[PDB]
Amino acid sequence: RGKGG
Amino acid sequence: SMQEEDTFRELRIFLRNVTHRLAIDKRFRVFTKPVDPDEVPDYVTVIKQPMDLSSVISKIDLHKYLTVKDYLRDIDLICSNALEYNPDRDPGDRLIRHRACALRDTAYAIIKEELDEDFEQLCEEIQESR
């Protein structure tokens, strides 16, 4: 989950 | 009637124009296409109703929106999905969230300035009669 970094 | 179909055609024109203006804004590039399951296979395990600006255009053209309230539910969905899929405090996620909220706020502001409330009411009344 999460795209950032 | 033909007059009701004219109404909905005007709605679609209005919605395409609003969506185009969102889609050309550099901040909202990440919302212009579906999240690619080949690149983000995790996405569907979290997000059960993907939505993006291209899919919004496809829905307008398919006559799926009979009111601006229904369009806004899908803009709300692009935003809520980004907040749900990218909730962490890292800057990349904060940036996507800020942009999601800007997309929502911008769509609502354009609609506030440019949608005639009686036009929307008419759309709602036609939809309710079907």
Residue numbers in the entry:
A (entry chain B): 3 to 7
B (entry chain A): 979 to 1108
Question: What does the article say, verbatim?
Answer:
All ATAD2 orthologs share a characteristic N-terminal AAA ATPase domain and a C-terminal bromodomain. Additional functional studies allowed us to characterize the normal function of Atad2, and to show that it is a general auxiliary factor targeting acetylated histones and facilitating chromatin-templated processes by maintaining chromatin accessible. However, in contrast to FACT, Atad2 bears a bromodomain capable of specifically guiding the protein toward acetylated histones where it could act as a molecular motor thanks to its AAA ATPase domain. To elucidate the structural basis of the ATAD2–histone interaction, we co-crystallized the ATAD2 bromodomain with peptides derived from the acetylated H4 tail.
We previously found the preference of ATAD2 bromodomain for multiple acetylated histone tails, and we had observed that mouse Atad2 preferentially binds to H4K5ac. Consequently, we focussed on H4 acetylated on K5 and K12. Hence, the purified ATAD2 bromodomain was crystallized with H4 tail peptides monoacetylated at either of these two sites. As described for other bromodomains, water molecules occupy the bottom of the acetyl-lysine binding site. For the two acetylated H4 peptides, residues R3 to G7 and G9 to G13 are well resolved in the electron density maps (lower left). However, apart from these conserved interactions, which are also shared with the binding mode of the isolated acetyl-lysine residue, the binding mode of the H4K5ac- and H4K12ac-containing peptides outside the central binding pocket is highly diverse. In contrast, the interactions with H4K5ac were more optimal, containing a number of main-chain and side-chain hydrogen bonds, as well as a salt bridge interaction between H4R3 and D1066 (upper right).
